[PDB]
Amino acid sequence: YQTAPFDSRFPNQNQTRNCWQNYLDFHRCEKAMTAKGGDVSVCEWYRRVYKSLCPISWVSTWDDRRAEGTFPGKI
Amino acid sequence: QTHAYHMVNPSPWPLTGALSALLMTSGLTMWFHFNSMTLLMIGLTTNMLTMYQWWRDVIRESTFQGHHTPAVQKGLRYGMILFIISEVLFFTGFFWAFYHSSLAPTPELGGCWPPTGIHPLNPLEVPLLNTSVLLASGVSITWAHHSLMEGDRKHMLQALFITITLGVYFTLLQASEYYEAPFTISDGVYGSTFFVATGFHGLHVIIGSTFLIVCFFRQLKFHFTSNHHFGFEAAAWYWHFVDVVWLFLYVSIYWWGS
Amino acid sequence: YEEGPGKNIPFSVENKWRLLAMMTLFFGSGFAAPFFIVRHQLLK
Amino acid sequence: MAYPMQLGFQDATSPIMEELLHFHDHTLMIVFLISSLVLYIISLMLTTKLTHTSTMDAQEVETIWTILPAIILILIALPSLRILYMMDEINNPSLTVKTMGHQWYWSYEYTDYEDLSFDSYMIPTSELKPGELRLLEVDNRVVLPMEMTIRMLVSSEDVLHSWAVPSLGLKTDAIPGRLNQTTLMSSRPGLYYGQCSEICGSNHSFMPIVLELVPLKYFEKWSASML
Amino acid sequence: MFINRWLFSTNHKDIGTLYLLFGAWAGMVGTALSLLIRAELGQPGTLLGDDQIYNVVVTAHAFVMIFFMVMPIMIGGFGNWLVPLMIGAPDMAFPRMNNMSFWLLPPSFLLLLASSMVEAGAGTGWTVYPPLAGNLAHAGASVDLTIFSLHLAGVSSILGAINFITTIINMKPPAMSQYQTPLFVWSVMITAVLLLLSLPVLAAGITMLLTDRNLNTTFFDPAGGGDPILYQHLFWFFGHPEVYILILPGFGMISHIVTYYSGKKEPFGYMGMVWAMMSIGFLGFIVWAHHMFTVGMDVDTRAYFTSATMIIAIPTGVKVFSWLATLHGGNIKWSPAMMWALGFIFLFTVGGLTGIVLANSSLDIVLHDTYYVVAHFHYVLSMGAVFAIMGGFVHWFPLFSGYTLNDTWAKIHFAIMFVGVNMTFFPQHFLGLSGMPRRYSDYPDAYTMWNTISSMGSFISLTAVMLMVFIIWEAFASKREVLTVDLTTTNLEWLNGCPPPYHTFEEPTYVNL
Amino acid sequence: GGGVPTDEEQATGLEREVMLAARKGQDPYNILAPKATSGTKEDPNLVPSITNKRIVGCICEEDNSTVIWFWLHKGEAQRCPSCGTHYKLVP
Amino acid sequence: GARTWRFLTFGLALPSVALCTLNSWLHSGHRERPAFIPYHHLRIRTKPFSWGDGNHTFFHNPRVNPLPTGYE
Amino acid sequence: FENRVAEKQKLFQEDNGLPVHLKGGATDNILYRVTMTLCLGGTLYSLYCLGWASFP
Amino acid sequence: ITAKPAKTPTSPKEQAIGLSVTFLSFLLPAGWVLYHLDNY
Ligand code: HEA
Ligand code: HEA
Ligand SMILES: CCCCC/C=C\C/C=C/C/C=C\C/C=C\CCCC(=O)O[C@H](COC(=O)CCCCCCCCCCCCCCCCC)COP(=O)(O)OCCN
Ligand SMILES: CCCCCC/C=C\CCCCCCCCCC(=O)O[C@H](COC(=O)CCCCCCCCCCCCCCC)COP(=O)(O)OC[C@@H](O)CO
Ligand SMILES: CCCCCCCCCCO[C@@H]1O[C@H](CO)[C@@H](O[C@H]2O[C@H](CO)[C@@H](O)[C@H](O)[C@H]2O)[C@H](O)[C@H]1O
Ligand SMILES: CCCCCCCCCCO[C@@H]1O[C@H](CO)[C@@H](O[C@H]2O[C@H](CO)[C@@H](O)[C@H](O)[C@H]2O)[C@H](O)[C@H]1O
Ligand code: CUA
Ligand SMILES: [O-][O-]
Ligand SMILES: [Cu+2]
Ligand code: NA
Ligand SMILES: [Xe]
Ligand SMILES: [Xe]
Ligand SMILES: [Xe]
Ligand SMILES: [Zn+2]
């Protein structure tokens, strides 16, 4: 892994939804793996991609809101 | 003169109108920033006085003095059509804002429309009733128009009274729905689009209802002839405009946006 | 109303020196205003 | 960077900036020729005592004056749109870097592997080292590997800014709540300068961008040393 | 009598006179602002202060030049004076509403000057983009006063547009079709349609900005799911038509001036000139996002906006070529008005061509928010719109006043202004290509030579503006009364004498079929 | 079901003058385009006026965009300076 | 004619309004308000409102409109 | 109601040189004076408010 | 255009006074502000 590859779902200058989708996918996967006490290593691809693309302040804000119970996306 | 056009007496109302606009805008500034309503209340008062005297004088010039030749009436027809077009483009800006926000919901909303935490109104309850009310008022105003052309004073008055009653019903229902709504203008772009677009529409309903009430009193005073009644035509065109904007709001914001 | 040259205007041209003063005050006030607004903003 | 008395573009540092120089040369020739022809025809219309003041038929001549401009516009649009789509083409970047605009400085985030981020502020004129450039130097440069395709993502944490590096042909608006992408590839090592390119308040003039382009191995060690 | 005549007017000529006096005063304000810009930039370093005071001056410069100088002079002034006379009409359709279009402007201007006096002013750019223009980064009353200034100017122009369209459609002689009206009358009708459609969209957008600032809406605030880029679309949907609104009445006056001083009875290719103005007006609504090539829109959208924008060159070229074909074979009178018009044809062409450069989104990446854009728009505004205003002013001053200018002084004025505007703006092309950004109070040292020369040019333009005031004074001071005007057979506005009586066409013209 | 006035009953001022003149096929307020004669010296276009001069605009040929404007004075017929069409003032 | 538009007013338009009035009437009465969650995209406060205590919307309904801190 | 339009036509066509905004009689002058007094007074007040708001 | 001779001719001296007064009305107030910037 070097950086996040081209994703045909997000081919344009606006990459906002690419960051968002990968953050959601990581957290959904993590919840699915921890519930059964499965393994969060299967979620690693989404983690690397959102960490590469997402501004630190966006991740930090979203993490705070998940802890607060105010995150508006479905996980 | 040997043309048919109206040379208007020198008038103070353009200046009182312009100054009322200064007092309203500087008044809103003073209300938003300096915690005071005084300038705004002076501006609203001078604006209403200006409108009253200006349109009073148009009635004097037409009904009482006979300056509204067919050429003058044709000009007024164009002016009212052009005014309505400008109002359509004003609403177009709000519909653009609505579609922009709702077709591409941002992450802050949950990336969905309606946003997470918004509970829209049921479009089949009061919003559907409001739709029936404005459509019904489009039928009754058409009855009023045909009664006036056919020379029937009693039926013109009854149909126009029904039209005004429906406009008032719509306004009272919308006031109640504003009070009952579980979302507010501060509930993100959902509240912003909903209240500003429906709010400007509600203001236009009040303006159009007022114009119809002016027509109702002028009819009671026998101002209209069976062939000459441009104030009534203009009020009817304005009222159809208000109906049509409502149908676009209903389909866009209340139904498709729910 | 008065018709004809020098009469279809809201300012008098009866005296060229009074007119110079009036034009000086009129154009001069417009040109000066931004300098005095800058001075006002700098002095806060 | 720009140099004194400069007339045209900064020398191209990237292949796309090279393409833009050749496209501008072609377009400027057309601007020169049309401007020149209009001035010449004005001077021709105005330099004869011969007259013809009766009604003149327009339709034949209007064909020339619509078709020839239509053909000129197509000759501009073709290479214009080839370059537009070349920049937009899928390139596979090796590295992603984020920049966040702020009043009045840039932050940079290199988060492919480790949590590297820092702020980049203008060097005050009174603190410039001898030979350094007024209003252009920063404390912490944007170190990047040369000869590599880099994905730059641009946003803001306050008002609009715009992240520009003229010699690489780059200008991407920095919009809060939006992540704008562009690609950067330097043909050469060195220092490449830009300036905030959206009005952002009191110090819009004073939040520059400096890229430092070096070999991958130097970039890797710098990255490690900045954690 | 004075109050009845000048505060209570229902007369198209006196209202036109009020607009020309207002626009002249506004021009002095806008000139002072332009000199403050060039004083700040005329040597490296800081003169006034940081970018806030600087961009308050830049923002006010643009609003004053556009909304208080060009629009009032071209539409309110020339349009009110000339349109009724050119169609033989006894006044405007709505002579009392006309007076309200005028009297809204002093209050609009007062709100703009209040914006600059309270807090730290509105240092936003004339585009007023959020979030810089929002209630966090511009807290306090300045931006709200700017928004209300725009509301009153917009109502003024919307009601004026309703008035002009109605007058031009409804009040021609019954034999006169739309294809027998002069080109200036066409230029005003098309400008009026653009105003009617564009200003309400600006009204919606700045109203949204007002509610974001004061009622906790979030149209443009991502925290609420809004988008700063939505504001830019609403603004520019108005803003591109607005630049056509600024030049179209100029195009109309240029057609009349070139025809008149070529000794011709008619412009070359009348129907082509009508077609070109309607085509420019239409295309002017479908190109706005060429102001947004760096915001991150999709490549196919950039391709469309590039192509649609370049199309405007075709009808515009027909007008330039038709002006040249009007000169062709003329008995040329080298009047001061003709010099303004010839300068217009050339300098407008240069600015239109740098616009075609900017239409190329790929090249616009590097030119956007640089002085290349500033050079483009000052060629079309400070040498196009302004040259058309000066040509129309010196051509029609004797009609309006009944007095002549000193033609030698007016030629001196033209020569000084021609040198000053070219010295000011030509070097800004180099500053843009080499990367100098817009809305900067100071620049890296490399940009010093061209900024120095540009500022020197601005002072030459100031000298021209001061001389113009003296030249108007000298005309009213000397009182040379007009006797005979040539070519009245094809210039109806002159046929009632100089100045025309308060009431003209009380008996309409006779035109048979 | 009556009680609405008619224009015949209630029209007043200039509106009423236009209405009554139109009933008589007359056009004192110039609402209609006058129809041309052959425009020869024997059969000039007759131009009504309430004074001793009136502006004529001559559309010399159908679909000309250029209108030729001139003052027509009481007295001998005058000619359009572009096409020579004759006009005679009838004050 | 007038007769036809009166027929449509009383025969179609007002019956429609009566039926929709009935529909709304039958679906009136309060639904249970949802759990308060202090979502950051709702209850926006970038500037105090120019009335009341600055924190209440213009047609504030205490029963269904929570403040930023929750229901009153 | 009775049709009194003819009586208002006579009043507003009286040859008394009054402009239409004053031709109704003494009530028109009063409402004109109230309107212009509020406008001009309000405008002077708006200028005072600018003076006040122009300083901290 | 043709025109009558001036009803109130403006001599070269009178023109120098008008031009001087006009230029001073622009230059003195702006010059006063710009001279005093440091003071502000
Ligand atoms: C009068 C005002 C005016 C006019 C008429 C124009 C006319 C044009 N403008 Fe301009 N423009 C502005 C005022 C004007 N502009 C302003 C104020 C801005 C900045 C806004 C801001 O950000 O503040 C601006 C910005 C602006 C931009 C945005 C640049 C950026 O911000 O990055 C672009 C992009 O395409 C553009 C293009 C054009 C084009 C293609 C025309 C065309 O209409 C020109 C057409 C004319 C010709 C081409 C010349 C004559 C034709 C011929 C002789 C025929 C032959 C020609 C060819 C074959 C090419 N202009
Ligand atoms: C009509 C529009 C117009 C006109 C004429 C001008 C004229 C001038 N402009 Fe400007 N300018 C703008 C519109 C205009 N400008 C706009 C829209 C911007 C962008 C703002 C922003 O970035 O937000 C701008 C920005 C701008 C900048 C860029 C600022 C920056 O990016 O930091 C500069 C820099 O030199 C400049 C300078 C000047 C100068 C020196 C003149 C001189 O040429 C002016 C000289 C004087 C005149 C031309 C006379 C004017 C008066 C009359 C014609 C009155 C006539 C009287 C009668 C008829 C009686 N202006
Ligand atoms: C039956 C409905 C009729 C509407 C009447 C209501 C109020 C008066 C104003 C009406 C004008 C319309 C729109 C103006 C903007 C916003 C109001 C929108 C409608 C409304 O009334 O919205 C309310 C908020 O009002 C608020 O903020 C109130 C804010 C009051 C001040 C308004 C500021 C005016 C804005 C300036 C207008 C500019 C005009 C532009 C002209 C263009 C010229 C070119 C909603 O209440 P809430 O408690 O948030 O939610 C309900 C919860 N139970
Ligand atoms: C609480 C809300 C407060 C806000 C303020 C606005 C409120 C209310 C305004 C209501 C509008 C009332 C208009 C009354 C017009 C009366 C004059 C009239 O109707 O005049 C008629 C002419 O029409 C004409 O001028 C036509 C004139 C048309 C004007 C219509 C304008 C709509 C105005 C909207 C203004 C604000 C909108 C902005 C919103 C963003 C007269 O000709 P006739 O009828 O043929 O009569 C002659 C016959 O008798 C001869 O036989
Ligand atoms: C025809 C002529 C036109 C009429 C002009 C009339 C001018 C009279 C205005 C009265 O002045 C008022 O003074 C109040 C206090 O002195 C202010 O109250 C406000 O400011 C107070 C601050 O002391 C606070 O109590 C509140 O914010 C609020 O009451 C209020 O803003 C202001 O208008
Ligand atoms: C962009 C438009 C401006 C362009 C440049 C204007 C050209 C300047 C015109 C003259 O302006 C004056 O200059 C004086 C100095 O020459 C100043 O006097 C100042 O300086 C004098 C010399 O030190 C003192 O005697 C005075 O008291 C002192 O006020 C004076 O105030 C100022 O009005
Ligand atoms: Cu940051 Cu400009
Ligand atoms: O706006 O070009
Ligand atoms: Cu544009
Ligand atoms: Na500087
Ligand atoms: Xe070009
Ligand atoms: Xe403005
Ligand atoms: Xe507006
Ligand atoms: Zn003829």
JSON list of C-alpha atoms in Angstrom, two decimals, chain D residues 2-10 20 23-24 31 34-35 39 41-42 45-46 51-53 55-56 58 61-62 65-66 73 76-77 80-81 83-85 88 134-136 158-160 169 171 173 175-176 178 180 195-205, chain E residues 44 50-51 55 123-124 129-132 137 222 229 232 264-266 268 294-296 299-300 302-303 310 314 318 321-322 324 327-330 334 342 346 350 353 360-362 365-366 368-369 430 433-434 437-447 449-450:
[
{"chain": "D", "resi": 2, "resn": "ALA", "atom": "CA", "xyz": [8.39, 35.45, -11.14]},
{"chain": "D", "resi": 3, "resn": "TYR", "atom": "CA", "xyz": [11.50, 37.54, -11.98]},
{"chain": "D", "resi": 4, "resn": "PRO", "atom": "CA", "xyz": [11.72, 41.32, -12.57]},
{"chain": "D", "resi": 5, "resn": "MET", "atom": "CA", "xyz": [10.18, 42.76, -15.77]},
{"chain": "D", "resi": 6, "resn": "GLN", "atom": "CA", "xyz": [8.61, 39.36, -16.60]},
{"chain": "D", "resi": 7, "resn": "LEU", "atom": "CA", "xyz": [6.20, 39.52, -19.61]},
{"chain": "D", "resi": 8, "resn": "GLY", "atom": "CA", "xyz": [4.85, 35.92, -19.84]},
{"chain": "D", "resi": 9, "resn": "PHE", "atom": "CA", "xyz": [4.34, 32.74, -17.84]},
{"chain": "D", "resi": 10, "resn": "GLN", "atom": "CA", "xyz": [6.85, 31.36, -15.33]},
{"chain": "D", "resi": 20, "resn": "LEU", "atom": "CA", "xyz": [-0.37, 25.34, -21.44]},
{"chain": "D", "resi": 23, "resn": "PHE", "atom": "CA", "xyz": [-1.49, 26.43, -26.20]},
{"chain": "D", "resi": 24, "resn": "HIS", "atom": "CA", "xyz": [-1.09, 30.07, -24.97]},
{"chain": "D", "resi": 31, "resn": "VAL", "atom": "CA", "xyz": [-5.23, 37.57, -30.39]},
{"chain": "D", "resi": 34, "resn": "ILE", "atom": "CA", "xyz": [-7.21, 39.81, -34.91]},
{"chain": "D", "resi": 35, "resn": "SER", "atom": "CA", "xyz": [-6.31, 42.94, -32.81]},
{"chain": "D", "resi": 39, "resn": "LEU", "atom": "CA", "xyz": [-6.59, 48.33, -36.04]},
{"chain": "D", "resi": 41, "resn": "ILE", "atom": "CA", "xyz": [-8.98, 48.08, -41.05]},
{"chain": "D", "resi": 42, "resn": "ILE", "atom": "CA", "xyz": [-9.92, 51.10, -38.83]},
{"chain": "D", "resi": 45, "resn": "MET", "atom": "CA", "xyz": [-11.54, 53.03, -43.42]},
{"chain": "D", "resi": 46, "resn": "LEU", "atom": "CA", "xyz": [-10.28, 56.46, -42.12]},
{"chain": "D", "resi": 51, "resn": "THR", "atom": "CA", "xyz": [-16.95, 58.12, -50.42]},
{"chain": "D", "resi": 52, "resn": "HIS", "atom": "CA", "xyz": [-19.87, 55.68, -50.79]},
{"chain": "D", "resi": 53, "resn": "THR", "atom": "CA", "xyz": [-22.79, 56.80, -48.48]},
{"chain": "D", "resi": 55, "resn": "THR", "atom": "CA", "xyz": [-27.29, 51.83, -48.73]},
{"chain": "D", "resi": 56, "resn": "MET", "atom": "CA", "xyz": [-24.87, 48.82, -48.77]},
{"chain": "D", "resi": 58, "resn": "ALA", "atom": "CA", "xyz": [-24.87, 43.01, -45.99]},
{"chain": "D", "resi": 61, "resn": "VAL", "atom": "CA", "xyz": [-20.13, 39.69, -46.33]},
{"chain": "D", "resi": 62, "resn": "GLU", "atom": "CA", "xyz": [-21.89, 38.38, -43.16]},
{"chain": "D", "resi": 65, "resn": "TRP", "atom": "CA", "xyz": [-17.66, 37.26, -40.83]},
{"chain": "D", "resi": 66, "resn": "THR", "atom": "CA", "xyz": [-19.48, 34.37, -39.08]},
{"chain": "D", "resi": 73, "resn": "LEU", "atom": "CA", "xyz": [-12.87, 29.29, -32.38]},
{"chain": "D", "resi": 76, "resn": "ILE", "atom": "CA", "xyz": [-8.73, 27.19, -30.31]},
{"chain": "D", "resi": 77, "resn": "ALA", "atom": "CA", "xyz": [-11.27, 24.80, -28.72]},
{"chain": "D", "resi": 80, "resn": "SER", "atom": "CA", "xyz": [-7.96, 23.64, -25.32]},
{"chain": "D", "resi": 81, "resn": "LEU", "atom": "CA", "xyz": [-10.20, 20.61, -24.70]},
{"chain": "D", "resi": 83, "resn": "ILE", "atom": "CA", "xyz": [-5.39, 19.70, -22.58]},
{"chain": "D", "resi": 84, "resn": "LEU", "atom": "CA", "xyz": [-8.53, 19.91, -20.34]},
{"chain": "D", "resi": 85, "resn": "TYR", "atom": "CA", "xyz": [-9.07, 16.11, -20.65]},
{"chain": "D", "resi": 88, "resn": "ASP", "atom": "CA", "xyz": [-8.32, 15.05, -15.90]},
{"chain": "D", "resi": 134, "resn": "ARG", "atom": "CA", "xyz": [9.95, 39.16, 0.44]},
{"chain": "D", "resi": 135, "resn": "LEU", "atom": "CA", "xyz": [6.39, 37.82, 0.92]},
{"chain": "D", "resi": 136, "resn": "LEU", "atom": "CA", "xyz": [7.27, 34.37, -0.62]},
{"chain": "D", "resi": 158, "resn": "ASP", "atom": "CA", "xyz": [-12.46, 28.76, 7.76]},
{"chain": "D", "resi": 159, "resn": "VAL", "atom": "CA", "xyz": [-13.10, 31.01, 4.70]},
{"chain": "D", "resi": 160, "resn": "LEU", "atom": "CA", "xyz": [-12.31, 30.42, 1.00]},
{"chain": "D", "resi": 169, "resn": "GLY", "atom": "CA", "xyz": [0.02, 25.05, -13.69]},
{"chain": "D", "resi": 171, "resn": "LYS", "atom": "CA", "xyz": [-4.79, 26.46, -8.83]},
{"chain": "D", "resi": 173, "resn": "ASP", "atom": "CA", "xyz": [-9.89, 26.47, -4.48]},
{"chain": "D", "resi": 175, "resn": "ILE", "atom": "CA", "xyz": [-13.53, 25.42, 0.31]},
{"chain": "D", "resi": 176, "resn": "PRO", "atom": "CA", "xyz": [-14.65, 24.41, 3.83]},
{"chain": "D", "resi": 178, "resn": "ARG", "atom": "CA", "xyz": [-15.14, 20.19, 0.36]},
{"chain": "D", "resi": 180, "resn": "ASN", "atom": "CA", "xyz": [-10.82, 19.25, -4.03]},
{"chain": "D", "resi": 195, "resn": "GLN", "atom": "CA", "xyz": [0.34, 32.62, -3.24]},
{"chain": "D", "resi": 196, "resn": "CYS", "atom": "CA", "xyz": [-3.18, 32.37, -1.79]},
{"chain": "D", "resi": 197, "resn": "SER", "atom": "CA", "xyz": [-5.58, 33.03, -4.74]},
{"chain": "D", "resi": 198, "resn": "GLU", "atom": "CA", "xyz": [-8.96, 33.70, -3.06]},
{"chain": "D", "resi": 199, "resn": "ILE", "atom": "CA", "xyz": [-9.65, 36.87, -1.04]},
{"chain": "D", "resi": 200, "resn": "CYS", "atom": "CA", "xyz": [-9.60, 35.60, 2.58]},
{"chain": "D", "resi": 201, "resn": "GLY", "atom": "CA", "xyz": [-9.33, 38.76, 4.76]},
{"chain": "D", "resi": 202, "resn": "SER", "atom": "CA", "xyz": [-6.60, 40.85, 6.47]},
{"chain": "D", "resi": 203, "resn": "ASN", "atom": "CA", "xyz": [-3.52, 38.79, 5.38]},
{"chain": "D", "resi": 204, "resn": "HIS", "atom": "CA", "xyz": [-4.65, 37.34, 1.99]},
{"chain": "D", "resi": 205, "resn": "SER", "atom": "CA", "xyz": [-1.41, 38.87, 0.49]},
{"chain": "E", "resi": 44, "resn": "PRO", "atom": "CA", "xyz": [6.23, 47.87, -2.89]},
{"chain": "E", "resi": 50, "resn": "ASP", "atom": "CA", "xyz": [-3.54, 45.41, 5.66]},
{"chain": "E", "resi": 51, "resn": "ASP", "atom": "CA", "xyz": [-5.82, 43.72, 3.10]},
{"chain": "E", "resi": 55, "resn": "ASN", "atom": "CA", "xyz": [-10.27, 45.35, -0.07]},
{"chain": "E", "resi": 123, "resn": "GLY", "atom": "CA", "xyz": [-13.71, 43.84, 2.48]},
{"chain": "E", "resi": 124, "resn": "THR", "atom": "CA", "xyz": [-15.31, 41.01, 0.51]},
{"chain": "E", "resi": 129, "resn": "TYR", "atom": "CA", "xyz": [-18.51, 35.38, -1.33]},
{"chain": "E", "resi": 130, "resn": "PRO", "atom": "CA", "xyz": [-19.18, 33.53, 1.91]},
{"chain": "E", "resi": 131, "resn": "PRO", "atom": "CA", "xyz": [-17.84, 32.51, 4.27]},
{"chain": "E", "resi": 132, "resn": "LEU", "atom": "CA", "xyz": [-15.57, 35.65, 4.26]},
{"chain": "E", "resi": 137, "resn": "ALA", "atom": "CA", "xyz": [-15.38, 36.45, 9.28]},
{"chain": "E", "resi": 222, "resn": "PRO", "atom": "CA", "xyz": [-21.48, 23.29, 5.42]},
{"chain": "E", "resi": 229, "resn": "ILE", "atom": "CA", "xyz": [-20.37, 27.17, -4.07]},
{"chain": "E", "resi": 232, "resn": "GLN", "atom": "CA", "xyz": [-21.22, 31.52, -6.44]},
{"chain": "E", "resi": 264, "resn": "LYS", "atom": "CA", "xyz": [-24.38, 57.69, -43.17]},
{"chain": "E", "resi": 265, "resn": "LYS", "atom": "CA", "xyz": [-28.19, 57.55, -42.97]},
{"chain": "E", "resi": 266, "resn": "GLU", "atom": "CA", "xyz": [-27.99, 54.05, -41.38]},
{"chain": "E", "resi": 268, "resn": "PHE", "atom": "CA", "xyz": [-24.34, 48.65, -41.92]},
{"chain": "E", "resi": 294, "resn": "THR", "atom": "CA", "xyz": [-11.05, 26.57, -10.16]},
{"chain": "E", "resi": 295, "resn": "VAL", "atom": "CA", "xyz": [-13.86, 25.60, -7.68]},
{"chain": "E", "resi": 296, "resn": "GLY", "atom": "CA", "xyz": [-13.68, 21.83, -8.48]},
{"chain": "E", "resi": 299, "resn": "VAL", "atom": "CA", "xyz": [-14.41, 18.07, -16.56]},
{"chain": "E", "resi": 300, "resn": "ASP", "atom": "CA", "xyz": [-17.47, 17.78, -18.90]},
{"chain": "E", "resi": 302, "resn": "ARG", "atom": "CA", "xyz": [-15.71, 22.75, -17.78]},
{"chain": "E", "resi": 303, "resn": "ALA", "atom": "CA", "xyz": [-15.75, 21.61, -21.45]},
{"chain": "E", "resi": 310, "resn": "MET", "atom": "CA", "xyz": [-16.34, 31.09, -26.94]},
{"chain": "E", "resi": 314, "resn": "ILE", "atom": "CA", "xyz": [-19.36, 35.15, -33.36]},
{"chain": "E", "resi": 318, "resn": "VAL", "atom": "CA", "xyz": [-20.52, 40.68, -36.57]},
{"chain": "E", "resi": 321, "resn": "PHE", "atom": "CA", "xyz": [-17.17, 44.20, -38.55]},
{"chain": "E", "resi": 322, "resn": "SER", "atom": "CA", "xyz": [-20.51, 46.03, -39.10]},
{"chain": "E", "resi": 324, "resn": "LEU", "atom": "CA", "xyz": [-16.03, 48.98, -39.64]},
{"chain": "E", "resi": 327, "resn": "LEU", "atom": "CA", "xyz": [-17.07, 53.73, -41.50]},
{"chain": "E", "resi": 328, "resn": "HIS", "atom": "CA", "xyz": [-16.34, 52.31, -45.03]},
{"chain": "E", "resi": 329, "resn": "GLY", "atom": "CA", "xyz": [-17.04, 55.03, -47.60]},
{"chain": "E", "resi": 330, "resn": "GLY", "atom": "CA", "xyz": [-17.96, 57.60, -44.94]},
{"chain": "E", "resi": 334, "resn": "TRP", "atom": "CA", "xyz": [-13.15, 63.61, -36.73]},
{"chain": "E", "resi": 342, "resn": "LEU", "atom": "CA", "xyz": [-12.96, 54.48, -32.71]},
{"chain": "E", "resi": 346, "resn": "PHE", "atom": "CA", "xyz": [-10.21, 48.77, -30.99]},
{"chain": "E", "resi": 350, "resn": "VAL", "atom": "CA", "xyz": [-8.59, 43.67, -27.35]},
{"chain": "E", "resi": 353, "resn": "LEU", "atom": "CA", "xyz": [-10.04, 38.68, -27.15]},
{"chain": "E", "resi": 360, "resn": "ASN", "atom": "CA", "xyz": [-10.31, 28.24, -22.00]},
{"chain": "E", "resi": 361, "resn": "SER", "atom": "CA", "xyz": [-10.74, 26.51, -18.57]},
{"chain": "E", "resi": 362, "resn": "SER", "atom": "CA", "xyz": [-7.28, 24.78, -18.85]},
{"chain": "E", "resi": 365, "resn": "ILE", "atom": "CA", "xyz": [-6.49, 27.55, -14.06]},
{"chain": "E", "resi": 366, "resn": "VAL", "atom": "CA", "xyz": [-3.30, 29.68, -14.24]},
{"chain": "E", "resi": 368, "resn": "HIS", "atom": "CA", "xyz": [-7.96, 32.90, -12.62]},
{"chain": "E", "resi": 369, "resn": "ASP", "atom": "CA", "xyz": [-7.69, 35.32, -9.63]},
{"chain": "E", "resi": 430, "resn": "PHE", "atom": "CA", "xyz": [2.25, 40.84, -17.75]},
{"chain": "E", "resi": 433, "resn": "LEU", "atom": "CA", "xyz": [0.76, 35.91, -16.87]},
{"chain": "E", "resi": 434, "resn": "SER", "atom": "CA", "xyz": [3.60, 36.09, -14.33]},
{"chain": "E", "resi": 437, "resn": "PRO", "atom": "CA", "xyz": [-2.96, 37.61, -7.61]},
{"chain": "E", "resi": 438, "resn": "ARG", "atom": "CA", "xyz": [-6.09, 39.77, -7.35]},
{"chain": "E", "resi": 439, "resn": "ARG", "atom": "CA", "xyz": [-7.10, 41.67, -4.21]},
{"chain": "E", "resi": 440, "resn": "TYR", "atom": "CA", "xyz": [-3.49, 42.00, -2.90]},
{"chain": "E", "resi": 441, "resn": "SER", "atom": "CA", "xyz": [-2.39, 45.18, -1.01]},
{"chain": "E", "resi": 442, "resn": "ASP", "atom": "CA", "xyz": [1.29, 44.21, -1.69]},
{"chain": "E", "resi": 443, "resn": "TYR", "atom": "CA", "xyz": [3.28, 42.01, -4.08]},
{"chain": "E", "resi": 444, "resn": "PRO", "atom": "CA", "xyz": [6.59, 40.15, -4.26]},
{"chain": "E", "resi": 445, "resn": "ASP", "atom": "CA", "xyz": [9.41, 42.46, -5.38]},
{"chain": "E", "resi": 446, "resn": "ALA", "atom": "CA", "xyz": [9.60, 41.01, -8.97]},
{"chain": "E", "resi": 447, "resn": "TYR", "atom": "CA", "xyz": [6.20, 42.65, -9.81]},
{"chain": "E", "resi": 449, "resn": "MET", "atom": "CA", "xyz": [8.13, 47.66, -12.47]},
{"chain": "E", "resi": 450, "resn": "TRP", "atom": "CA", "xyz": [4.67, 46.92, -13.96]}
]
